[PDB]
Amino acid sequence: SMEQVAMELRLTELTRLLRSVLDQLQDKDPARIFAQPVSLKEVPDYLDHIKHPMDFATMRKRLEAQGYKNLHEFEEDFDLIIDNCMKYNARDTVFYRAAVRLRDQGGVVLRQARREVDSIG
C-alpha cells in the first residue's frame, strides 16, 4: 500500500531530525565519556549496578535502523545515559560532573527539538 509509504517518509524525516539532535547532544560530550557503552571487560560488575546501560553509539545504531518511533523514546534513551552515570559514579567525580553538564546543556537542544516535532508533525 501507498498509505504505508507515507508513514515511512514521515518516519524517515523524524529519523532525519533526530540525527541532527543527537549530533548536537554528542557535541555536549567533548570528552567522549558517553560515546561508547561502559566496557564489561573493564567493569565486570556493571550490570549488577545498572540494568539498562545506554551510550551515544548504541542510540546511533538504533537511529540508523529507524528504531525511534517518537521523540519521547529518544529522550528516554538520553536520560538513561545521564541517570546511570549519576548513580554509578559518586558526586565528586569527573564522570558525574560530566552527566550534570550534558543534562543542563542538552535540555536546550531538546526543548527546541520538542517544538519542531510538534510543528512539523
Side-chain angles (χ1 to χ4, degrees), residues 1-2 4-6 8 11-15 17-40 42-60 62-68 70-110 112-119 121:
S1 81
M2 198 94 179
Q4 298 305 299
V5 171
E8 290 157 35
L11 177 65
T12 290
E13 289 300 286
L14 178 58
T15 310
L17 194 145
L18 293 183
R19 196 170 302 122
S20 164
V21 181
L22 196 63
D23 294 332
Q24 296 184 65
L25 290 177
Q26 188 163 15
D27 290 356
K28 305 311 163 149
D29 176 29
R32 297 199 66 90
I33 291 150
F34 301 114
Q36 299 282 340
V38 166
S39 138
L40 301 194
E42 296 180 13
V43 184
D45 70 354
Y46 190 62
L47 300 181
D48 297 339
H49 295 271
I50 296 295
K51 299 295 160 186
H52 304 99
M54 195 40 50
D55 68 88
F56 287 130
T58 306
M59 291 191 58
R60 190 167 307 282
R62 176 164 165 179
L63 190 67
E64 300 305 325
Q66 294 193 345
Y68 284 111
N70 58 60
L71 172 71
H72 187 70
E73 285 186 353
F74 183 90
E75 263 173 338
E76 281 202 337
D77 268 1
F78 174 60
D79 289 347
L80 267 190
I81 305 184
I82 291 305
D83 290 337
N84 285 342
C85 194
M86 298 180 62
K87 296 174 199 69
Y88 185 78
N89 305 106
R91 213 139 37 239
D92 71 329
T93 67
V94 73
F95 300 105
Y96 181 121
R97 292 179 181 271
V100 159
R101 290 171 62 79
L102 177 54
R103 180 191 67 187
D104 289 1
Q105 299 189 313
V108 184
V109 168
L110 288 170
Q112 194 58 31
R114 167 47 83 197
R115 298 187 71 88
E116 296 188 310
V117 172
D118 294 22
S119 177

